[PDB]
A paper describes a structure:
Here we identify PTP1B as an inhibitor of IL-6 and show that, in vitro, it can dephosphorylate all four members of the JAK family. Dephosphorylation of substrate is initiated by nucleophilic attack by the active-site cysteine (Cys215) to form a phosphoenzyme intermediate followed by hydrolysis of the cysteinyl-phosphate to release free phosphate. Asp181 acts as both a proton donor, enabling protonation of the tyrosyl leaving group, and as a proton acceptor, receiving a proton from the water molecule that hydrolyzes the phosphoenzyme intermediate.
Interestingly, the D181A/Q262A mutant exists in two states in the apo-form. The majority of the apo-protein has a Tm of 70 °C (similar to the substrate bound form of the triple mutant), whilst the minor species has a Tm of 55 °C. Titration of substrate leads to a progressive increase in the Tm of the minor species until it all exists in the Tm = 70 °C state. To better understand the interesting thermal shift profile of the D181A/Q262A double mutant, we solved its crystal structure in both apo- and substrate-bound forms. It is possible that a preference for being in the closed position, even in apo form, explains the hyper-stable apo-species seen in the thermal shift profile of the D181A/Q262A double mutant. The reason for the extremely slow off-rate compared to C215A alone is unclear, however we note that incorporation of the D181A/Q262A mutations seem to stabilise the WPD-loop in a closed conformation, in which F182 may restrict exit of the tyrosine from the active site. This preference for the closed conformation can be seen in the structure of the Q262A mutant alone. Likewise, the WPD-loop open conformation is stabilised by an interaction between Arg112 and Asp181 (PDB 2CM226), an interaction that is also not possible in the double or triple mutant.
Author numbering: 1 to 298
Write the structure that this text describes.
């Protein structure tokens, strides 16, 4: 309600750009010394997107423990996320090492491998059952088990094997294929339909490690996804939509990784998604079916 009131006031004042810039100005600035070491230059996709030292994920290797990935630990909401860049051709083994070591069950990919004529992410998972991937540097094997292809997203079941111990784990890969870089989803319905698909899988459950979320830089689309999820979880705990301060939650998230939410319209969309999702949180379970229809997933 208060969230809806502010939305209307910002929309009427046409002040989303000013609100968004205020977030950028107030956001945390912490050191990223490890990310900027010369030996790690080729492990970073973007010069101006780096993990803070205090929240970076460490690989459990003695050689070089660096990956461009951050642990977003939301204490009040009691949920954690790992946000990371789209893997590079030389960091795909590191990426799956992180998934293994952090005990994650789900990977959420919000970008395509090719966007706007450029390569934004390595092809880090297998596309055919019979052509598995072996990451020799990290001693992992990855096999495609099945895939459920919808109109604007695909869910894949993967098997990740630790070749050292022969232990295997099911990984669920949620690929949103129609969300443009520096853009927004087609509608709140299409976004929420996808988010609750991830939730229903158990990939966000506290009995698993943190879900891994990435786009190309791991801040814009990735930040929008986690902001909406965290706001809806906070609302769920109290059944109180007016108790959720979206800008305060975003500033809290930005303590753990820089640059979350990359445009003013992504911030506006985050409000829209949370305002619409509140319908389900506050007890209208039928709205989930409506989102599925409006998403045209079939």
């Amino acid at each position: 309600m208060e969230m809806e009131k502010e939305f209307e006031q910002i929309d009427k004042s046409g002040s989303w750009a000013a609100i968004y810039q205020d977030i950028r100005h107030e956001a945390s600035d912490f050191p990223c010394r490890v990310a900027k070491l010369p030996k790690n230059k080729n492990r970073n996709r973007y010069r101006d997107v780096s993990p803070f030292d205090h929240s970076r994920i460490k690989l459990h290797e003695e050689d070089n423990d660096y990956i461009n990935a951050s642990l977003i630990k939301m204490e009040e909401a009691q949920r954690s996320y790992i946000l990371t860049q789209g893997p590079l051709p030389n960091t795909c083994g590191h990426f799956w090492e992180m998934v293994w070591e952090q005990k994650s069950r789900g990977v959420v990919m919000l970008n395509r491998v090719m966007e706007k004529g450029s390569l934004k992410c390595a092809q880090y998972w297998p596309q055919k059952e019979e052509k598995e991937m072996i990451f020799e540097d990290t001693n992992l094997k990855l096999t495609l088990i099945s895939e459920d292809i919808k109109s604007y997203y695909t869910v894949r079941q993967l098997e990740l094997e630790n070749l050292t111990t022969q232990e295997t784990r099911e990984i669920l890969h949620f690929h949103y294929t129609t969300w443009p870089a520096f853009g927004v989803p087609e509608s709140p319905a299409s976004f929420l339909n996808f988010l609750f698909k991830v939730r229903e899988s158990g990939s966000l459950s506290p009995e698993h490690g943190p879900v891994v979320v990435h786009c190309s830089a791991g801040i814009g689309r990735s930040g929008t996804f986690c902001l909406a999820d965290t706001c809806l979880l906070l609302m769920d705990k109290r059944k109180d939509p007016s108790s959720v301060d979206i800008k305060k939650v975003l500033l809290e998230m930005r303590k753990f990784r820089m640059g979350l939410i990359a445009t003013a319209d992504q911030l506006r969309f985050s409000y829209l998604a949370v305002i619409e999702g509140a319908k389900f949180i506050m007890g209208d379970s039928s709205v989930q079916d409506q989102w599925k229809e409006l998403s045209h997933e079939a």
